[PDB]
């Protein structure tokens, strides 16, 4: 970073990117046969249930292997963009 | 090929061919010409400023003394063109 303000902006951007990646992983976790009714284009009143249950998604992911693989794939896909920020926040004279 | 440039020569060549803004004067170029087996190319930079004497050499011509006169190399991906043993163009990539 050039100065302290740039460092703070980079930290906030990293935090928001991690939050977005976690949200993407949570969305990708729903690609199972159990949520076929919810994923269909109809009227479902349980939309808020899938969003408010934030602490259950991690527990469900840690129990299944296919869910874990899907989650890590989605996390890598959403984290490539986060890794791409180094070229924006890095100077041309950076040794690394 | 079995033998590569290495971990240091690769970085040095990247720095030489990427910066394109640091010009080597006659003394440094002649000092570096001792290790190179080929002769010295034309300076190609006569005046870089209205009140700048001692015409200098560009960085990419220093790397051009490492090829035989009859060797021609073309790398479309990195836009690298070598004609008559002289490096003509280079943009980025460091893949060649």
């Amino acid at each position: 970073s050039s100065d302290l303000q740039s460092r703070k902006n980079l930290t906030e951007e990293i935090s928001y990117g991690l939050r977005e990646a976690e949200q993407v992983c949570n969305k990708q976790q729903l690609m199972v046969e159990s949520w076929r009714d919810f994923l269909a284009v109809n009227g479902e009143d349980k939309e808020e249930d899938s969003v408010s249950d934030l602490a259950r998604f991690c527990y469900e992911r840690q129990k299944s292997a296919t869910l874990s693989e899907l989650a890590v794939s989605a996390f890598k896909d959403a984290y490539r963009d986060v890794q791409a920020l180094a070229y924006r926040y890095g100077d041309q004279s950076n040794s690394f | 090929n079995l033998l590569s440039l290495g971990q240091d020569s690769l970085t040095a060549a990247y720095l030489v061919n990427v910066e394109k803004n640091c010009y080597l004067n006659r003394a440094q170029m002649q000092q570096l010409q001792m290790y190179c087996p080929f002769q010295l190319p034309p300076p190609a930079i006569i005046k870089a400023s209205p009140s700048s004497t001692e015409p200098q050499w560009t960085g990419m011509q220093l790397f051009g003394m490492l090829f035989p006169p009859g060797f021609d190399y073309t790398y479309p991906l990195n836009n690298v063109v070598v004609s008559n043993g002289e490096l003509l163009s280079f943009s980025e990539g460091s893949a060649w």
Binding site: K27, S50, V51 | -
Partner: protein, 544 residues
Amino acid sequence: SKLPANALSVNSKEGYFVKPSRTNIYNRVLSILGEGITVGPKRFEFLAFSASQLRGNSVWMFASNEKVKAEDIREWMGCFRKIRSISKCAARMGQLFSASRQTLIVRAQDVEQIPDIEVTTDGADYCFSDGIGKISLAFAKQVAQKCGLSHVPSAFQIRYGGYKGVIAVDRSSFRKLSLRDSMLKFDSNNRMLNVTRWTESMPCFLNREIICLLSTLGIEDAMFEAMQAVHLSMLGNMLEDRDAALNVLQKLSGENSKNLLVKMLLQGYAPSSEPYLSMMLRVHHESQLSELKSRCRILVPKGRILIGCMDEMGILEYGQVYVRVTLTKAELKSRDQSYFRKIDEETSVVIGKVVVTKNPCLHPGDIRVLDAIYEVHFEEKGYLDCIIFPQKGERPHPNECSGGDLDGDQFFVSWDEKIIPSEMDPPMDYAGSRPRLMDHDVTLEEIHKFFVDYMISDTLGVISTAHLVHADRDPEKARSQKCLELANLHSRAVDFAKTGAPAEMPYALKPREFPDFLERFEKPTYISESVFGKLYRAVKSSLA
């Protein structure tokens, strides 16, 4: 004006997936449709809506009375509980609202049940008989007496008792009336006969899509430029020359039409005199110029627009049809031609290469070159103002014509010789979307939902404009996958009135640019260098 898509069901991203949110206008329209409109000592109720009214956001309302109520009329029209599709039920209920002429009443004692013919090739269901029928000579004479029609057409569109389709004449009829199997739409308590259109031998016209799809087979720009030049030359000479006025009136609107202006055109005074006629000619010329500026409409005297039917002969093969039309002033003046056969004084046969085209066309494979032949057996049946389609073949001709049907639809025919038939392209698939069937009868609410949702995601009018813009911009038009996708989307949007399948117009397909020959002055205008641009520049130069 039309309700914008943003005024109803505005999209909003709530949760993981985007869900549209209904606006207050949606609820207001639903309440108006449900409760009804009260005007004085009356309360109007929803009866039905026609296919034309569905595309214009119009609906019929009937005030309930002590004698007959809305439900009484609804059940008198027929029983619609057999249809389990929301769109199909509405279409069948609203189809019986077209203008027609009343005729005699025929009971349900003499009706035939002639079996149809079906061909299944390459795993595709191709049906030749979609809405074709059979009629006798006595029935035609009886039905033509009340309409004041002298000549007996060989084909005329008719609908009665829920049936709908065109019927053709025959010389081996058994009784007055006959019917096929693939014609019953819904059961009705009445069988009133009525006829909408019998025959219209109007001269053919070249629309924008015809030139757009015919500009890749090898047709140069010199032909269209010369045709436009001669058209404008004969239009400009119509003012000071009375001879050209009659010829134009006899070759532009109505082959055989009697009018006060038409009679005076052949024998009249100088154009300077008779202001009542001179100013009418001037305003007609101005209207023609405005129509040409708005859209391309080329007057081709060697082609007509007529419906088509089939005969129970089975002699014609795949690629052989019969073309027969009346003789106009140009045909009568010089009937000696290679592809024109003077079978009769008023009727002339055609032996040239004739193609079939419709109004909506967005696929290069619709151009199917057909060779017309002359047979004594076919002429013995006496077919007039109707092209003959073979019974047998790999696929029916209407199927190749954008998946159409023999429902009295008009067909463009032209016995031209300077076209290029060397290039042939297969037609697109005519298979529609899967029908949606409900598990319960209609409670008069889902039909209202479908009617209101018709306004939302109604992209029928923009697909054609986008296709035209993409064809004008990108060279080698109607060859890339973008044109195929646009044609598929247009077909799906047309099918939306029949089955509830939204077009789903993508955002990236919007043109965001329009050529000179459009009325979108506010939108950015770009100079087009295609054949349409050349024609528009020629028209502008002629006007100036």
